[PDB]
């Protein structure tokens, strides 16, 4: 493998998806250099089932990067075993989740004085989500199911926007496509 994994094109993107409609980018057939993620702003870096200092020596059959924007106080919901209106209605991780969660404060880019209404979350649904399920329907709840974040630079930290990237590590009885150097 001569190609390098396009982490740069995931983390340094101008635009992130809404949490109700989280975006998945597939990483494959590449060399996974994780030093940059350790090197940087990226205040939140929690790995489950794997050590962040050993990723340089591992091989995977696939790596999946799930990108979305949430509030600072909602960052704790992006973890296995957790519940809440993000964990239950927007983005659910499995209890046996294997992977790393990276998040940073994007107030400088996403917040607006008039209010940034581009980012939305789901508040109403008839049931909870299954692991890695996505629901982007707008059917009226027996309420309009989606509501804006309205991010502003005048908000305290808990209400400031955070950009979250979840790196899921797939390990199967199959030839690896992604290996560190």
């Amino acid at each position, epitope marked *: 493998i001569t190609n390098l994994c*396009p982490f740069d094109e995931v983390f340094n*993107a*101008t635009r992130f998806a809404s949490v109700y409609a989280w975006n998945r980018k597939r990483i494959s057939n590449c060399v996974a250099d994780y030093s940059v993620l350790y090197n940087l702003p990226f205040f939140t870096f929690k790995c489950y089932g794997v050590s962040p200092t050993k990723l340089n020596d591992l091989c995977f059959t696939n790596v999946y990067a799930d990108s979305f924007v949430i509030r600072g106080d909602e960052v704790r919901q992006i973890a296995p075993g957790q519940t809440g209106n993000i964990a239950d209605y927007n983005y659910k991780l499995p209890d046996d989740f294997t992977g790393c969660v990276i998040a940073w404060n994007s107030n400088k880019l996403d917040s607006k004085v008039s209010g940034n209404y581009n980012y939305l979350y789901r508040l109403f649904r008839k049931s909870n989500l299954k692991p890695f399920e996505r629901d982007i329907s707008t059917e009226i709840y027996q309420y309009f199911p989606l509501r804006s974040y309205s991010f502003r630079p005048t908000y305290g930290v808990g209400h400031q926007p955070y950009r979250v990237v979840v790196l899921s590590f797939e390990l199967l009885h199959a030839p690896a496509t992604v290996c560190g150097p």
Partner: antibody
Amino acid sequence: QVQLVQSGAEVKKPGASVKVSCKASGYPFTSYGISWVRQAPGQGLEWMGWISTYNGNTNYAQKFQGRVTMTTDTSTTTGYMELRRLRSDDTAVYYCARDYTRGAWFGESLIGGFDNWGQGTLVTVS
Amino acid sequence: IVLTQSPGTLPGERATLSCRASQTVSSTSLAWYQQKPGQAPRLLIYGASSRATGIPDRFSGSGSGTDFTLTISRLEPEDFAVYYCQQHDTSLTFGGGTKVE
């Protein structure tokens, strides 16, 4: 230690085509795209188009949509551009640059700019 | 998106250069370039604020909405060049160019 080395000046007749090369080194070729910008004498910078070194995807400026073709060769880590049916108004210096404004793998916009530039290739039409 | 720069033509003094867009341009999609005589343009500012590697601290950019600027806190003999603004919020454009003299 990134460098971009372009071919020397060319002189063409009206209706002729010119192909300008740009050899890249000092970085992983397939991790960054290639952009082309030209500058006519006394003028500013005009964007011609962009190509991904990873998947061959292109994005051209409307002005050259039917005139310019861009290709890459990953074995020689070199970019190429061809501009067809040249006119006297196409006399300009054509520059190559390393593109970190759009991703090569996903095609999405990045937070960046054109950091590394070649010396420029002068093309004269007469 | 159309980018208009001013003044047409502007050592040790502070310099300010302006670039106004006809349409809103995101902080993430705007950059500034410098071109010396006989040389290719180089990147100075990206993300409307962050400095490119190798760029002196005297160069700083900022802005929002449709109004962005580039400031040089004191001009050096080598800072006399043509500066350009760029946006890639929609397609990719360059401004007319502003000369420091």
